[PDB]
């Protein structure tokens, strides 16, 4: 199948085993922003579902299928590849919906949907939108979408922005400098220091931050799920031309994403921006191995290139230069091995952000 060709079996095993746990489902359902927005997007576009046929890709607990039923769907085909599919079949029986929701255990690329649906609902967003490569499974499912059918979500908007966070950057060398001692229990570890630095810099940082660490308005790259094909997500070239609004050391690029459910009645937005309430996707920042000096009025240009891998993720290549000085910087990161930095502390504003006397 198409899924088997692009995924090493070792990746799918650990992947779907993860999603088999009700503790992981619960974590997602308890995300009020995620679950509430999906509920509103469906129930408030009830004409898009009333008496419609619905395909729920990666239904998990089937919670989205129940919202489709709550909106008046006629038949709902709920596809789930993890062993969560049997827990959803329990929910469907006990909610007395066996006549309207049909749980189909298996990967959407492998099951035989019997018919064509009028609308496809799914939650295929990984962190940085593209992780887990479920977007392709969401696009693959369009083989069951009747012509003139809809996709919930309809579009996805990944936002890039350059940030400054000296503490985040200096944390990398602080940790790797463990190896820079000549007599750790009598062993000289220093030869491995450069490797430790490279390892920590290959890691995207998954946490949140204060908006004021950004130094330029965000650049938005848009995937239209109604138009995009599977192969479009294998190579994702995201050119950027940021205009600096703040002077400082650029330490990397911050990422977040929004999706819009463009219904016949109203368009509902689910946004993981740093402006909005925190969601379980947080935000992701990619450091630069070497920071770039840029003043307000310079242009930071470069490309962010995402190359899908057989581990259901993306290899990230970020090149960036300050056009006025030519000083450039590269970095490669493994989206599959992020660093979960979030501690719960409300993010601190960058130093030197007080323009009036705080003592006043």
């Amino acid at each position: 199948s198409v899924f088997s060709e692009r995924t090493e079996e070792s990746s799918a095993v650990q992947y779907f085993q993860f999603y088999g746990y009700l503790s992981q489902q619960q974590n997602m359902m308890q995300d009020y922003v995620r679950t509430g927005t999906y509920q509103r997007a469906i129930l408030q576009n009830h004409t898009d579902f009333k008496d419609k046929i619905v395909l729920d890709v990666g239904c998990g607990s089937g919670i989205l299928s129940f919202f489709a039923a709550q909106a008046g769907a006629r038949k709902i085909y709920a596809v789930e590849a993890s062993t969560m599919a049997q827990h959803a079949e329990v929910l469907v029986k006990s909610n007395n919906l066996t006549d309207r929701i049909v749980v189909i255990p298996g990967k959407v690329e492998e099951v035989s949907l019997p018919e064509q649906v009028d609308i496809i609902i799914s939650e295929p967003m990984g962190y940085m939108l593209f992780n887990e490569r479920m977007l392709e499974s969401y696009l693959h499912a369009k083989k069951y979408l009747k012509p003139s059918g809809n996709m919930f979500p309809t579009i996805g908007d990944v936002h890039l922005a350059p940030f400054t966070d000296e503490q985040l950057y200096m944390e990398q060398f602080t940790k790797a400098n463990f190896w820079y001692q000549p007599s750790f229990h009598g062993v000289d570890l220093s030869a491995l220091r450069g490797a430790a630095v490279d390892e920590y810099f290959r890691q995207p940082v998954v946490d949140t931050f204060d908006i004021r660490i950004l130094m330029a308005k965000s650049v938005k790259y848009t995937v239209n799920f109604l138009e995009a094909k599977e192969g479009d997500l294998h190579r994702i070239e995201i050119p950027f031309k940021f205009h600096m609004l703040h002077s400082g050391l650029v330490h990397g690029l911050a990422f977040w994403f929004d999706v819009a459910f463009i219904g016949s009645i109203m368009t509902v937005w689910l946004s993981t921006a740093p402006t909005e309430p925190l969601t379980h996707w947080y935000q992701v920042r990619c450091l630069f191995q070497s920071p770039l000096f840029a003043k307000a009025g310079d242009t930071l240009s470069g490309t962010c290139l995402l190359i899908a891998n057989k581990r259901q993720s993306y290899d990230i290549s970020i090149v960036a230069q300050v056009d006025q000085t030519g000083s450039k910087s590269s970095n490669l990161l493994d989206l599959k091995n992020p660093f979960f930095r979030y501690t719960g502390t409300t993010p601190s504003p960058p130093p030197g952000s007080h323009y009036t006397s705080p003592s006043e």
Partner: peptide
């Protein structure tokens, strides 16, 4: 990755 979805505190 190990944890596709991250834990969000309640």
């Amino acid at each position: 990755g190990k944890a596709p979805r991250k834990q969000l505190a309640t």
